[PDB]
Write a protein that binds this DNA or RNA. Structure first.
Lengths: 102, 99, 83, 75, 98, 121, 83, 97, 96, 111
DNA sequence: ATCATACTAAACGTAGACAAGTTGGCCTGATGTATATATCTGACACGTGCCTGGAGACTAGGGAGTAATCCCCTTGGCGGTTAAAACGCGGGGGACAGCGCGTACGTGCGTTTAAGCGGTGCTAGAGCTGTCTACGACCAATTGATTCCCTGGTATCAGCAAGTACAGTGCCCTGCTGACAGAGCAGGAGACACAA
DNA sequence: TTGTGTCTCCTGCTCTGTCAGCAGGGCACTGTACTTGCTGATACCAGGGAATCAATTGGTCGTAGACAGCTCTAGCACCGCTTAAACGCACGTACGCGCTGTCCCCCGCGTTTTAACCGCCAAGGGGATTACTCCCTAGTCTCCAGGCACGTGTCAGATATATACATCAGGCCAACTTGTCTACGTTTAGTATGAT
């Protein structure tokens, strides 16, 4: 199989937005990518660390806690509404004018 | 799989709790009796000891050493340490008036 | 019949247990010789007083009351063995 | 006479290049091993470290002044 | 033939006091010996202090006043107060019932 | 004349400890040339009171320890817990009494947020 | 007639001199109040014993012998004032 | 500029001066007033022999000098030269007070 | 009338002039020596009384005093005091 | 007939301290029911020995200080310098005595 | 005539002279202590009167010494079990050393305070003596409380097996960062090919 | 046949993926102390009896001390003056306390050695009891001299003054090391001269 052209930021955004509640955790993101891309069955630690770094680095994602402790084993990340669309018009690979807080 | 292993200081606290809860004598009786007979040999030869006398001596000695170790632990903690050093015992005896 | 080096009979685990009852968490390696010396001095004093009491009574057996009186003379009164 | 202590300091810090900076004690050990009367040059080493820090050739990681650890500059 | 000298003790009185305080609790032999030693120790302390008090004032008799002062000197505050109260009560009752 | 029924001097004073024995011990203890009539009564009352105090505290300790017999451990606990008796019996050692359990605060372990394996510095 | 704050009469220089006789080179600023407290406690104990001795003798004047006996009972025997 | 000794010099001179002397170091009248004040709690309208007050002052100064010796030893044990209230507390605790 | 207070002053002075013929002693030092003599007398007498009582004896003999001296004084002081006391008692017994 | 000339028991024992007074103090001190004949002699001898020792050391200290009379300072020096007497009189305070001159080596200036 | 190549002048890089900063040791003034000499005063040492406490002489009785006996507790020996001590080794974290800094404490000076000394005056209360009466010692006879021993019965405690609860340690996920490497895309320049 | 507009390559910015490390915490696994239940051992308690010895009652007798009254000692209050000590403030430095780093010492745990512990037996050494006896110490009376109170002289210590000496602290000179500036060698530009 071939590597998808889609950048990890676009993959995370689509995974977050595709849920009925517009919200998913890291485990559910792993479930979605496993279901919809057989290619990523290899280089597991590589792409796992890559997406974790992307989540901790990109400013278009912000974390939210769990009120009654939830099932737990990890926190939850909300998409930043102010970022809007960034990968629109087919440019899934290299976004222009990245979102920034400052 | 590596075997279980407590970190340093945990079993020390367990031993502190165990030996502060209990009351039995901590020194082996027979070596202490031999020591008592040895020391008394200098003052008078061919002495006999009532068993009660040896038990009283052991009780007094253990109580004295326990109190001394309380004082020396306080002395060590005063110097911002956890390990009791011989200088701590020396200071405790000096303040008590034994030295 | 003669006794030579029984001070070493107060082994390292025994001194360690005595320290543990005193609330000591960590013990230096040189504490044990120091503790043996201190214990020997204390025993020598108490036994000297007790044997003096025994000799005064013209006995040959060191009774428990002799040790009790000897300890009381040091200001270390002991309850449980008479007196 | 030999070279100035600054060159020896740079050599010592560049010899090991640990992920964290070399501590003052480690650098002193390195200088002693390389051969230097470090007993009577503590002030020399301290002022050399301060000068190197000020000139930017060395970057201090955790401590202040001579304390802490030092590592080589970015370039 | 060959008797053995009787040994006096406070064991029965300690037992009576204990059953006055804790009717259901017992006491072991070692604890009884410790209490006997304690009673003898405090007795000798108070008696010696009373003797010294009598000697200082050049009086040849120990009275309840010397014992009262000795109790005041030896025991700390609350124990001294309660001991003086008990002793005064006992002496007054003894004098009245005499 | 017929003798009246004998009443113990303790019974007159309402005590449990022996007034007569205390009087004999005062006379034979070489404390003074003469001993008053009320001195044994006062001393016996004081000794009875102190014994009652220590036994009350020791029984409380034994009850807390779920034991129905007072042992030297309970006497030690009672003595050292009460500050007055501890001051009275500061220079006294109780056989088989042990020591009060206490650990200095600095010796207790320092709580750490990290759950990683401990390693040398 | 009344006395209210005489513990402050043990001034800072006096405590400094007492420390100097004891071999103290440097003194923390918080020592003075601590020393005043310690001295007050010691005086309270000794004077309580002395006044008890005075009361037993039915006197109203505290004599030097009362103080000497109080100190001896405390375990701090004093030589120079009789006894 | 005026002469000025460095810190610790006059302190050592004072130590040498007061260790070789014997006169009492507390002022007599303030100590007498303190003694009368403390005794007032135990019995009103007490009187004191002058020798009684002198004996009290002697005992108190001797006690404080010994306590300060032990305090100095405690301070030196902790790698310090300044005595602090913790040192007095430790000395009293080990003594049994 | 006039009071009458006894003390060891003359005996202390005699001992002093036996040891140091040309040395005097102030009144305060004499009072201290009187206090010392009284204190040691009390200690030895009390220990001797305790020794007599422990053995159920109603007499304080020279043996009780000897044991009390050995119990109280340290090593060399105890030995010299015992020697002096034994010599004094022997001389007294022979002379009378 | 006439009695023999009275001789003090101290003279018989060869002492300076009073055997008679010591015997009286033993008898009237409530120490025991009876007091042996030799107990006063022994106790007086011991007291004289101890007094002589302390006075010897005090006179030595006074001579070192270049004084003719012994004062409490000299007694303090004599007692605390000697190990045996200091052990005997460890818990005793001497009025108008000083303290032994000593300064901990840490406090001395760093030369 | 037009070009390159060598000699000389000025820019660039590097080795050595110069001046500035740091440390150690010696000299000089200030200051406290130590020593020497004269004056004086009150605290020590010596002398006298006396009175009370120690010595001489004698007797009585009971405390202490000595001998004999007994049986109880100390000492010593033997064998088996296994609990404790001794040894070895890996490694965590605590003792120790070094550096930095800031403020708490030491030294010194001027002003305020009251301690110290001396003298006057008053009187609460220590200290003593004399009476005499209630209280404590002593003794004899009575008796009842206290101790010791044995029995039956019980409660309590000690030990062992099984289950539970608490707490200690660390896996493994998740989150955050510095640093090295790599795909997209905007803008500028050479190549292709057109309009006149 | 050439100037010119558009296509395609080269340059650099922007943004992304990735290696490795560190740290926070949910939760699994392990270990150890606690609790429950049962069985067997023994230690306490109650009753009875005998022994025994000492506490109580009644009476007599001596003196310890409570009480009254007087003497005169010293504890207390006040005032005035001198000046030594205390207090407040200014200034500076060195010492306490925090932080970082390192590496050796002690803790924890597994394995082997060993000597403690228990049970049993035996012998006999010495502590305890009993009887007899004798001589040592309390009690009493008489008497005198040893020690204490009081009084007085003088010289040893206290005070004052002057002089010497040891120590402390600052300043300055001399020696070692490093920052800044300058001269020799190398390289490129300008001008004279040889080559073609």
């Amino acid at each position: 199989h071939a590597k998808p052209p889609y950048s990890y930021i676009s993959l995370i955004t689509m995974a977050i937005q595709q849920a009925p509640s517009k919200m998913l955790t890291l485990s559910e993101i792993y479930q979605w990518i496993m279901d919809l891309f057989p290619y990523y069955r290899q280089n597991q630690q590589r792409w796992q660390n890559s997406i974790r770094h992307s989540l901790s680095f990109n400013d278009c994602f912000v974390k939210v806690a769990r009120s009654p402790d939830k099932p737990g084993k990890g926190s939850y990340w909300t998409l930043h509404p102010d970022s809007g669309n960034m990968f629109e018009n087919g440019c899934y690979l290299r976004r222009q004018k990245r979102f920034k807080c400052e | 799989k590596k075997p279980h292993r407590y970190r340093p200081g945990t079993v020390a606290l367990r031993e502190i709790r165990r030996y502060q809860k209990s009351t039995e004598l901590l020194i082996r009786k027979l070596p202490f009796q031999r020591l008592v007979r040895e020391i008394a040999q200098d003052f008078k030869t061919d002495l006999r000891f009532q068993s009660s006398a040896v038990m009283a001596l052991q009780e007094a000695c253990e109580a004295y050493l326990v109190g001394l170790f309380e004082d020396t632990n306080l002395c060590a903690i005063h110097a911002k340490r956890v390990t009791i050093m011989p200088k701590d015992i020396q200071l405790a005896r000096r303040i008590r008036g034994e030295r | 019949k003669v006794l030579r080096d029984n001070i070493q009979g107060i082994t390292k685990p025994a001194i360690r247990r005595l320290a543990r009852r005193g609330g000591v968490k960590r013990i230096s390696g040189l504490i044990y010789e120091e503790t043996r010396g201190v214990l020997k001095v204390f025993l020598e004093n108490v036994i000297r007083d007790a044997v003096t009491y025994t000799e005064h009574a013209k006995r040959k057996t060191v009774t428990a009351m002799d040790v009790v009186y000897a300890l009381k003379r040091q200001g270390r009164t002991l309850y449980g063995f008479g007196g | 006479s030999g070279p100035p202590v600054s060159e020896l300091i740079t050599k010592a810090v560049a010899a090991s290049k640990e992920r964290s900076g070399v501590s003052l004690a480690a650098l002193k050990k390195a200088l002693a091993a390389a051969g230097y009367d470090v007993e009577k040059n503590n002030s020399r080493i301290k002022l050399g470290l301060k000068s190197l820090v000020s000139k930017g050739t060395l970057v201090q990681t955790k401590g202040t002044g001579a304390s802490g650890s030092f590592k080589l500059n970015k370039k | 033939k060959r008797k053995r000298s009787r040994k006096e003790s406070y064991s029965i009185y300690v037992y009576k006091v204990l059953k006055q305080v804790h009717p259901d609790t017992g006491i072991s032999s070692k604890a009884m010996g410790i209490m006997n030693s304690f009673v003898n120790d405090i007795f000798e302390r108070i008696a010696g202090e009373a003797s010294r008090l009598a000697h200082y004032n050049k009086r040849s008799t120990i009275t309840s006043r010397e014992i009262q002062t000795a109790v005041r000197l030896l025991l700390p505050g609350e124990l001294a107060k309660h001991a003086v109260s008990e002793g005064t009560k006992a002496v007054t009752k003894y004098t009245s019932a005499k | 004349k017929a003798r009246a029924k004998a009443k113990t001097r303790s019974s007159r004073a309402g005590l449990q400890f022996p007034v007569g024995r205390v009087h004999r011990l005062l006379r034979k203890g070489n404390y003074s040339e003469r001993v008053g009539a009320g001195a044994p009564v006062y001393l016996a009352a004081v000794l009875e009171y102190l014994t009652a105090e220590i036994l009350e505290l020791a029984g409380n300790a034994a009850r807390d320890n779920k034991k129905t017999r007072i042992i030297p451990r309970h006497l030690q606990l009672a003595i050292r817990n009460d500050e007055e008796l501890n001051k009275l019996l500061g220079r006294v050692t109780i056989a088989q009494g042990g020591v009060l359990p206490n650990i200095q605060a600095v010796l207790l372990p320092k709580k750490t947020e990290s759950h990683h394996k401990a390693k040398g510095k």
